[PDB]
Design a protein around this ligand. Structure first.
Ligand SMILES: CSc1ncc2cc3cnccc3c([N+](=O)[O-])c2n1
Length: 328
């Protein structure tokens, strides 16, 4: 059956919770257990109350995110198709109860300093169900790092980490992220110079430039094992395809064109679209502490422009990884 919040967040862990993120879906908290930071994603399910102005998902509607989080976490421990480029999933729990007052306290501090688009989650009764996803702490998203990266050299490492991770997932799981906006790319300092991946049994390395990328948030994602497909059917969604003000909202339209509004099919070009969006973000909205002033740097800049100009003529992240000149 379900367990109380205390099962997931004993006193200690609860008292150390800071809010780090939010969406229509719910709330993300940072905390510490065994000296180790973790992120807690908390989602209300099965209830009749609107939350942040939308209906709660049923268990059946939240399953696909649970399944896909697990599958992509497991790639860190595989052999033929191995990557750490997704986020480690420590645990999943179904929780019953009102929202812990100590989580409300973390929620209020966030609302005060940063401000929130969400309802104060203080209106839940003691029968309310939540899914609690605990992740390894993956760092801070690429959006919030807009002005924080050192040079375009770092950009190349990020795009390489992202392409390799998506390629490994393509080969293993026929995976599409389908919502890889720069909010869903996390960066973390690493003292490792090379990062390792295996694709179809063949191991290579990517220079880190002191960063480790983690792809998050599998709420729109798709994959399959033994011809069983797990996905979010957005065939009948309206709002997803009517956004503007950012290349992001074009990718929703361009995905729907590629797959003729059939979201069960495998179209790995969706990964190429998102990688083009991210490459576009690197050149147009990221600003670096050190511009390209030396000759070897202006080369890296030209190769990323060339990437941006060409990558849409590749059929998958796999095709990019193995055929694009940026990665030779
Ligand atoms: C879904 S919005 C969000 N905002 C911020 C986050 C930060 C995270 C840090 N580390 C690991 C996971 C993290 C997640 N997540 O996957 O739910 C985050 N999610």
């Amino acid at each position: 059956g379900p367990v109380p919040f205390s099962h997931c967040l004993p006193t200690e862990k609860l008292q150390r919770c800071e809010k780090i993120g939010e969406g229509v879906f719910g709330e993300v908290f940072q905390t510490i257990a065994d000296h180790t930071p973790v992120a807690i994603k908390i989602i209300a399910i099965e209830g009749p109350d609107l939350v942040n102005g939308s209906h709660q998902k049923t268990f059946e509607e939240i399953l696909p995110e649970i399944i896909i989080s697990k599958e992509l976490s497991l790639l860190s421990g595989e052999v033929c198709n191995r990557t750490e480029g997704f986020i480690g999933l420590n645990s999943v729990h179904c929780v019953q109860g009102s929202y812990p007052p100590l989580l409300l306290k973390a929620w209020d501090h966030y609302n005060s300093t940063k401000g929130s688009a969400n309802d104060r989650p203080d209106f839940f009764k003691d029968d309310q169900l939540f899914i609690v996803l605990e992740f390894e702490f993956g760092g801070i998203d690429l959006e919030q790092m807009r002005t924080k990266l050192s040079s375009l050299a770092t950009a190349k490492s990020i795009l390489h980490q992202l392409t390799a991770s998506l390629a490994v997932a393509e080969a293993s799981l026929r995976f599409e992220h389908r919502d890889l906006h720069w909010g869903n790319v996390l960066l973390k300092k690493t003292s490792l110079k090379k990062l390792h991946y295996t694709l179809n049994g063949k191991s290579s390395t990517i220079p880190s430039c002191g960063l480790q990328v983690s792809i998050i948030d599998y709420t729109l994602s798709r994959l399959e094992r033994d011809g069983i497909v797990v996905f979010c059917d957005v065939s009948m969604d309206e709002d997803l395809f009517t956004g503007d003000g950012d290349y992001q909202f074009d990718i929703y339209r361009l995905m729907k064109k590629e797959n003729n509004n059939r979201w069960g099919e495998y179209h790995p070009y969706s990964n190429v679209l998102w990688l083009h969006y991210l490459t576009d973000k690197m050149l147009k909205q990221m600003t670096f502490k050190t511009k390209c002033n030396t000759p070897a740097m202006k080369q890296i800049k030209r190769k990323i422009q060339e990437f941006h100009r060409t990558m849409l003529n590749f059929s998958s992240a796999t095709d990019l990884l193995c055929q694009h000149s940026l990665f030779k």
